[PDB]
Amino acid sequence: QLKRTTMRILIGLLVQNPELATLVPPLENLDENKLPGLGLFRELVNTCLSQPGLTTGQLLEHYRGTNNAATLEKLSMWDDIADKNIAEQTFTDSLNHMFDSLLELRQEELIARERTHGLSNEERLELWTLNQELAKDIPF
Ligand SMILES: [Zn+2]
Ligand SMILES: [Zn+2]
């Protein structure tokens, strides 16, 4: 009866449909500490890209023995996301929500940085840009 969250959907859908990994943009320069589940998601995407065509069982086997194995097992049997017809649309929708979340975190970071240290011209333009566009047992 797992409740839906952005990272649960992304990781769950990827485990159940590893071919979805090809839809993910490069995540190399993201800070996994800013978003629970992001580090795991990025690991899974890299595994899938390393072995095109791998099945769900082959993906889960690669992660046997890791500290996330039990969580991926649960997401692999999570039938709330099991529908194949809407899987891809749900994946790309949730991808955008994840990056939306990172935008909101960055805006909050720049606001805090502005009070404590002030902003550079580049950072102040970034904050202005964010303000305009943002106005318009599983641990994640
Ligand atoms: Zn590996
Ligand atoms: Zn949406």
**Cα-based distances in Å from 37 to 10, 61, 62, 140:** 9, 19, 18, 5
Quote the tokens at residue 111: 């606001």
Ligand number, closest to the Cα atom of 66: 1
Residue carrying structure tokens 């082959």: 58
CA of 64 to the centre of ligand 1 (A): 10
Compute, in angstroms, the gap from residue 27 CA to the centroid of ligand 1.
Answer: 16
Q: Report the alpha-carbon distance of residue 113 to residue 122 in Å, rounded.
A: 13
Task: Measure the CA–CA gap between 114 and 139, rounded to whole angstroms.
Answer: 31
Contacts of 26 (CB under 8 A, 6+ apart): none
Mutual orientation of helices 6-16 and 38-50 as an angle, nearest 10°?
20
Tokens of 70: 């039990």
Ligand 1 center from residue 21 Cα (angstroms): 15
Q: What whole-number distance in Å separates Cα of residue 68 and Cα of residue 59?
A: 13
Method used experimentally: X-ray
* Residue 72 contacts residue 63 (beta carbons within 8 Å): yes
Type of residue numbered 45: V
The C-alpha atoms of residue 3 and residue 40 are separated, in whole angstroms, by 18
Distance separating alpha carbons of residues 53 and 123, to the nearest angstrom: 42
Of the chain, the end-to-end C-alpha distance in Å amounts to 15
**Helices (H) then strands (E): counts for the chain:** 6, 0
Q: Which ligand is nearest to the CA of 89?
A: 2
Specified resolution (Å): 2.1
CA of 112 to the centre of ligand 1 (A): 37
Pick the ligand that lies closest to the CA of residue 9: 2
Q: Where are the alpha helices (DSSP H) in 17-120?
A: 38-50, 56-62, 69-76, 87-117
Cα within 13 Å of Cα(71), Cβ side: 16
DSSP letter at 83 equals -
CATH of region 1-140: 1.10.860.10
Query: Rounded to whole angstroms, what are the CA distances from 132 to 58, 81, 108, 110, 118?
Result: 44, 34, 14, 14, 20
- The domain limits of the chain are 1-140
* Chain position carrying tokens 């047992």: 137
Task: Answer yes or no: are the C-beta atoms of 98 and 7 closer than 8 Å.
Answer: yes
d(CA 83, ligand 1 centre) in Å: 28
Q: How many residues does the chain have?
A: 140
